[PDB]
Ligand binder design. Structure first.
Ligand SMILES: Nc1ncnc2c1ncn2[C@@H]1O[C@H](COP(=O)(O)OP(=O)(O)NP(=O)(O)O)[C@@H](O)[C@H]1O
Length: 269
């Protein structure tokens, strides 16, 4: 079942039920049936039958252990975020999956206003809340992309739920390309990192999987772990980006760049 066919199975009542979950996510993981019903203005027994069907379609997860409650699955939060995008007129048709990992699923899509785009659906103080965390990641990526506009990153078009709509870049991940000028490519990445840093942004997950390259130049993507300069740990997070990208170039190309000196250079500007 592709996300487009799933979308086709939803009626108005289905969307209202999902809106009622979404609007109560901040105070419950599993939103009580009574509250889904009251918010949606759908009687309890009918709301219950909707949620059972949504669960059969893997859009919600229903629990009954302590009380009758429901929350989004990944697919469901994504479907609902897509809906917000369609209703807002920013997306007209979802397209094919481009790829999926542990952190996101990225789809092709078409917008009359913005052309052929990507929509990226996000997955995933006490170290040991799926939806609120995925939505927070999405918003973080959207805000970083907005702050970076004009640099070599995708243009950003919208954020709803766990979804960020952005420009399709026609370029390959660095890790799939054998560049013949690695020293110059590494310097271009490091210069872009300095530009982010001058805008008050640290990427936070820089790697060979989110530098894109073409004959035209490089682009950088993937900002859900980004932080603002002078956030807790920002400097160490920045050093890690610089060290990690330099280390990939050392392993792959035996480039000679010194990590500590590259960091001090970016930091001094
Ligand atoms: N705007 C874009 N244009 C072209 N391809 C993109 C775009 N966003 C994502 N992709 C492709 O989809 C992949 C996954 O997106 P990405 O933003 O890196 O999320 P992630 O897979 O969840 N984290 P990671 O693999 O660590 O970079 C990329 O490595 C790109 O190959």
């Amino acid at each position: 079942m592709n996300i487009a066919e799933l979308y086709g199975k939803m009626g108005k009542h289905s969307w209202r039920i999902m809106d009622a979950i979404f609007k109560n996510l901040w105070d419950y993981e599993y939103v009580p049936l009574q509250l889904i019903s009251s918010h949606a203005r759908i009687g309890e027994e009918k709301a219950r039958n909707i949620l059972k069907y949504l669960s059969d379609l893997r859009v919600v997860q229903n629990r009954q252990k302590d009380y009758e409650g429901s929350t989004f699955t990944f697919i469901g939060l994504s479907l609902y975020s897509l809906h917000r995008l369609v209703r807002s007129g920013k997306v007209d048709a979802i397209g094919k999956l481009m790829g999926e990992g542990k952190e996101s699923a990225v789809f092709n899509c078409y917008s009359e206003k913005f052309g052929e785009c990507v929509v990226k659906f996000h997955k995933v103080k006490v170290k040991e809340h799926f939806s609120v965390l995925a939505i927070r990641s999405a918003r973080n990526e959207f805000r970083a992309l907005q702050k970076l506009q004009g640099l070599a990153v995708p243009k950003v078009y919208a954020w709803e739920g766990n979804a960020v709509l952005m420009e399709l870049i026609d370029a390959k991940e660095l890790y799939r390309v054998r560049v013949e000028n690695p020293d110059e490519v590494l310097d271009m990445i490091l210069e872009e990192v300095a530009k982010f840093y001058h805008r008050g942004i640290v990427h936070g997950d820089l790697s060979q999987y989110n530098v894109l390259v073409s004959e035209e130049g490089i682009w950088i993507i993937d900002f859900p772990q980004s932080v603002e300069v002078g956030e807790e740990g920002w400097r160490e997070i920045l050093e890690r980006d610089v060290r990690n990208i330099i280390t990939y170039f050392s392993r792959t190309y035996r480039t000679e760049k010194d990590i500590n000196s590259a960091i001090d250079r970016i930091l001094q500007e």
